Amino acid sequence: SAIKKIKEMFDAVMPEDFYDFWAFCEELNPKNPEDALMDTMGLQLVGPYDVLTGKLDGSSYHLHWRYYYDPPEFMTVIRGNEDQGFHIGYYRDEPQALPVFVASNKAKVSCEMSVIGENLFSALNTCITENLKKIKDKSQQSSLKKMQTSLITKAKELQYSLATTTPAIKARNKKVNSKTLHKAGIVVPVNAMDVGYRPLTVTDAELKKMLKTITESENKSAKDKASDELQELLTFVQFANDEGDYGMGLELGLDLFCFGSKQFHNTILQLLPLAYQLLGREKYAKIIQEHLENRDREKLS
At what resolution in Å was this solved?
Answer: 2.7
Element (DSSP H or E) covering residue 159 = none
Element (DSSP H or E) covering residue 70 = none
Q: Tell me how far apart the alpha carbons of residues 258 and 165 are, in angstroms, rounded to a whole number.
A: 24
Q: Tell me how far apart the alpha carbons of residues 75 and 123 are, in angstroms, rounded to a whole number.
A: 14
Method: X-ray
What residue spans define the domains of the chain? 2-158, 188-293
Q: Tell me how far apart the alpha carbons of residues 84 and 106 are, in angstroms, rounded to a whole number.
A: 5
Burial class of 278 by CB neighbour count within 10 A (0 to 12, 13 to 18, 19+) = middle
Helix-then-strand count for the chain, H and E: 13, 5
The verdict on whether 243 is a catalytic residue reads yes
Residue 46 and residue 76 in contact, taking contact as beta carbons nearer than 8 Å: yes
Task: Select which of 16, 82, 206, 243 is catalytic.
Answer: 243
Element (DSSP H or E) covering residue 90 = strand 86-91
Query: What residues form DSSP beta bridges with 299?
Result: none
CA dihedral 287, 239, 178, 60 (to 10 degrees): 0
Q: Tell me how far apart the alpha carbons of residues 133 and 129 are, in angstroms, rounded to a whole number.
A: 7
Q: Tell me how far apart the alpha carbons of residues 249 and 237 are, in angstroms, rounded to a whole number.
A: 5
Q: How far is CA 98 from CA 113, 119, 206, 242, 300, in A?
A: 18, 11, 34, 30, 25
One-letter identity of residue 63: L
